[PDB]
Amino acid sequence: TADLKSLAKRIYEAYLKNFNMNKVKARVILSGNPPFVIHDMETLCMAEKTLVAKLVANGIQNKEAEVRIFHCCQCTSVETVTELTEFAKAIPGFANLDLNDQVTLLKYGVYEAIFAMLSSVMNKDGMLVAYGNGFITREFLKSLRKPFCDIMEPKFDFAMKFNALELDDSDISLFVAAIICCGDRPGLLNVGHIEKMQEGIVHVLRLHLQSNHPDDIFLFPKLLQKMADLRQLVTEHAQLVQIIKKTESDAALHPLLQEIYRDMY
Numbered sequence: 180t181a182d183l184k185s186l187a188k189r190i191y192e193a194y195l196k197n198f199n200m201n202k203v204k205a206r207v208i209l210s211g212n213p214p215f216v217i218h219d220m221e222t223l224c225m226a227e228k229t230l231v232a233k234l235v236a237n238g239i240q241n242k243e244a245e246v247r248i249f250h251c252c253q254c255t256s257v258e259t260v261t262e263l264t265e266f267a268k269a270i271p272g273f274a275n276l277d278l279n280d281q282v283t284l285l286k287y288g289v290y291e292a293i294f295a296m297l298s299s300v301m302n303k304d305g306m307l308v309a310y311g312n313g314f315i316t317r318e319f320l321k322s323l324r325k326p327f328c329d330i331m332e333p334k335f336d337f338a339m340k341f342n343a344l345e346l347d348d349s350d351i352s353l354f355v356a357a358i359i360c361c362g363d364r365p366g367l368l369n370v371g372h373i374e375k376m377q378e379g380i381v382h383v384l385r386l387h388l389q390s391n392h393p394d395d396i397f398l399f400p401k402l403l404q405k406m407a408d409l410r411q412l413v414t415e416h417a418q419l420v421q422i423i424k425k426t427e428s429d430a431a432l433h434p435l436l437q438e439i440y441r442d443m444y
């Protein structure tokens with residue numbers, strides 16, 4: 180229907196406006212200011228001097244490479260949280276929710292959305308970083324000292340299967356909106372209204388996938404399962420972050436992310 184197709188287009192346009200990275204932009208870069216390839220410590224350190232110069236301007240006081248990398252991971256998440264917060268305003272009913280419910284939905288949804296969207300910048304060999312200006316290899320990330328080598332690999336595993344679904348930005352935008360609209364998040368004040376907001380977005384997602392992916396009759400339930408898989412990926416990620424927090428004193432957690440993780444798992 181015109182209203183439902185228009186809603187899907189709205190959410191797609193809001194996604195293109197609000198996220199610095201989209202799947203088309205990522206694919207243009209990945210196909211070959213080209214991205215600097217980070218595949219070892221030499222190339223990490225060269226990339227840092229150009230792309231995150233302040234982080235390595237401290238001489239012998241610079242942090243360990245793994246800690247610098249984790250800091251850059253967190254800065255990326257902080258920026259994506261800001262983008263997701265603006266995007267959520269395009270979702271029918273979201274801005275009409277109580278301010279506290281908006282906070283709760285974003286708190287529990289952002290990392291699920293982050294890992295879903297991260298797939299768009301990942302291939303089997305590595306991922307784009309730093310606003311598309313670096314490509315860091317999967318093998319380099321696996322080579323880091325424990326526990327830091329354990330951060331990205333499960334996200335690559337998720338992404339390879341997610342990317343095999345061959346979603347486009349029009350699908351991913353609605354999937355991210357659906358992640359944000361979960362009525363079963365803890366602490367919600369108006370569950371009923373959130374459930375109806377969820378039902379509306381999920382209806383739009385179902386119809387859109389039927390229209391955009393006529394070849395895959397299971398795509399909607401596949402994506403419902405991916406949402407559950409993302410919840411488990413995030414719980415596991417939070418457990419690893421808590422290990423880092425307890426055992427890696429140099430790996431300072433950004434305060435916005437500390438609040439997101441607080442009282443989550």
Ligand SMILES: CCCCCCCCCCCCCCCC(=O)O
Pocket residue numbers: 223226227230231248251252253255256257297308309313315420436
């Ligand atoms: C010189 C640039 C080095 C870049 C280092 C890798 C950046 C990865 C960005 C994606 C991070 C995904 C994981 C987020 C982790 C978290 O916020 O808890």
